[PDB]
A paper describes a structure:
RecQ helicases are a family of DNA strand-separating enzymes conserved from bacteria to humans that play a crucial role in the maintenance of genome stability. The helicase catalytic core is crucial for the ATPase and DNA-unwinding activities of these RecQ proteins. The helicase catalytic core of DrRecQ contains four domains assembled in a trilobed or Y-shaped manner, with major clefts on its surface.
The apoenzyme structure was subsequently used to solve the binary complex structure with ADP at resolution of 2.90 Å. ADP is bound with extensive interactions with the protein. The adenine moiety is sandwiched between Arg26 and Tyr22. The diphosphate is bound by backbone amides of motif I. ADP binding to the D1 domain causes slight alterations in motif I. The sequence alignment shows that motifs 0 (amino acids 16–29) and I (amino acids 45–53) are highly conserved in three RecQ proteins. The distinct domain orientation also indicates the interdomain flexibility of the WH domain. This motion generates a closed conformation in the binary complex structure and slightly enlarges the cleft between Zn-binding and WH domains in the apoform structure.
Author numbering: 5 to 295, 300 to 521
The structure:
Amino acid sequence: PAALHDRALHLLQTIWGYPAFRGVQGEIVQQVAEGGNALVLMPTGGGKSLCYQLPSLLRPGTGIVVSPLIALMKDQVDTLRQNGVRAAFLNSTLLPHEAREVEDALLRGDLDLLYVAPERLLMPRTLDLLERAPVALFAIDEAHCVSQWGHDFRPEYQQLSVLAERFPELPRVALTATADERTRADIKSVLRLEDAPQFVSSFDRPNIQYRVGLKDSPKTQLLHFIREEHPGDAGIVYCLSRKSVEETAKWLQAQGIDALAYHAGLSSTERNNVQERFLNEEGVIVCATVAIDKPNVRFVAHLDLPKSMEGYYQETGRAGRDGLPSTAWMVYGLSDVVNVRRMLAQSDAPEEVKRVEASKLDALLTYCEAATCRRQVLLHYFGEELSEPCGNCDVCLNPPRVRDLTREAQMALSATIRTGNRFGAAHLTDVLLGRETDKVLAQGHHQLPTFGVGKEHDEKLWRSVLRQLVSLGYLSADDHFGLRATGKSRGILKEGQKLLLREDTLLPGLEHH
Ligand SMILES: Nc1ncnc2c1ncn2[C@@H]1O[C@H](COP(=O)(O)OP(=O)(O)O)[C@@H](O)[C@H]1O
Ligand SMILES: [Zn+2]
C-alpha cells in the first residue's frame, strides 16, 4: 500500500541516514517488498546495495545475498551489523561450529540478511537447508557474471539458475552495474527474469556535454578547443597508442600548455609523479591510454574512438564529479573504423567473438553518426530511456544537417517483420535489394512481396539505415545477430516519427582512391 512505502522510508531515514530514494530505488524496493522479481541496472555507486537490503527488512524472513566477492561481503556484513541490521556471512572457511551457529540463526528466523559465497550456496544441503528456512528473497549481485559476454565470468554463476527452479515462489533480484543490451538477455535467461520488470537509474550525468566530430588535423582541433573553452582547466585527453599519447603530450607542451603522458610503461616513479601533479595542482592536463582519481575535471578529449561504448562511458565519466558543468569532446575518422574492422577480421579470435566485437564497433560508430540527441543514443545502450532531447549535447545545440529516410526505414522495418524477426542485417539487405543468395533461396524469401522492393538504393545505404534503426531502438538484435522490430517500430510505421541520417555521412560520392 502507501503504508508499505511509509514503512520503508522510516527505515531509510533511521538506518542508512539517506533522506530519500535515488532514481528508481523506491520503485524497486516496493516491487520486491511485495513479492515481485526484478532486474536492476545501476552504475557503480548508483545505490544498488539497498535495493535488496530494504526489502529484506520489510518482508518477513531473511534476504539471501550472493556475490563472488568475499572480502567485500565481510565488510558489508560488519557495517550492516554496527548499523543495527542483523546480518551474517556463511562460506566454507568458517569453522564448522561457526557455520552452524549461523545456519541455526537462519532457521530460527534471526537474520535480516545472509551473505553467501556461490561456492556454498550451490552445494545441495545449502540448497536443501534453505527450503527449511524463513527466506524473504534472493539477491544475485554482480549478476552479470552469469554471462560469457559478461565483463567477468564464472562457471559457478551459470549455475545460479537453480534458484529459480528450487525456489520459484520466492522473489529474485538481480543487480549489476555493467550490462550491454544483452549480457542482459543472459542474466534474464539464467535467472529466469524474462518476465520481471527491469530498472535502470543513475546512468545519466546531466552536467557533462557530449560532442563528437570528425578528424582533420586533430591536434590543432584539440588545441583550439582547450584554448577557447578551458584555458586554466584540468582535463584528460585519451589516445589509443602509447605513441600518440607521448606525441600529443610533447606537442601540447611545445605550445606550452601543461601536459603529461600517462601509461603502463611509465616507470613507477613517473606514474605517481604525474598522478599528484595532476591531483594537487589545478589546470594540468593528462594524456592517458586505457591506464585513477580527480574531483573537478572540466574536459575529456578523445583523439580516437574507444574500443567500446562501455569504455567511452567510463572515460568521459571522469569529467565532472562536481555537479559543475564539464565537456566531453571527441573526434574520430572513418579511416580508423575501417582499420579496427580489418584488425579484428584477421585476428585469431572465434567467429562468435568477432560478431560480438563488430557489434560493439557498429554501435560505437553509429553513436558518432547520430542525427538525433546523443544522450538518448548513449543511454539506450545501457538501457536508460530519455524521453526528450537533452539540450546538453552537440546534436541538440547545433543540429546537424539531416536526410529523411523514413520511407526507407519502413521498408527495412517491414522487411524484417514479414520475415519473422530472426534474420541479420547482411541478410535482410539481400532481401530489399533483390539479391537471390543461395542462402536467400533456402528461406524462399525471394517469393515474398518485400523482395528487391528497396532496389533504388545500394548496400552501404541499407546497412547504415539498418545500423541506425538498431541504434535508435527501432530494431533489436535477437540471435544470432538477427533483428526484431520493437514496440517502438510503430512510431515509424504509424509515422509521425522519422528516420534521419547525417548529410555528413552521405556526401556527393562516389568514393575514390
Ligand atoms: N537513495 C539514495 N540517496 C542518496 N545517496 C544514495 C542513495 N543510495 C545510495 N547512495 C549512496 O551512494 C552509494 C551507493 O553505493 P552502494 O549502494 O553502497 O553499492 P553500489 O555501488 O552497488 O550502489 C551508497 O553507499 C551511498 O553513499
Ligand atoms: Zn542532446
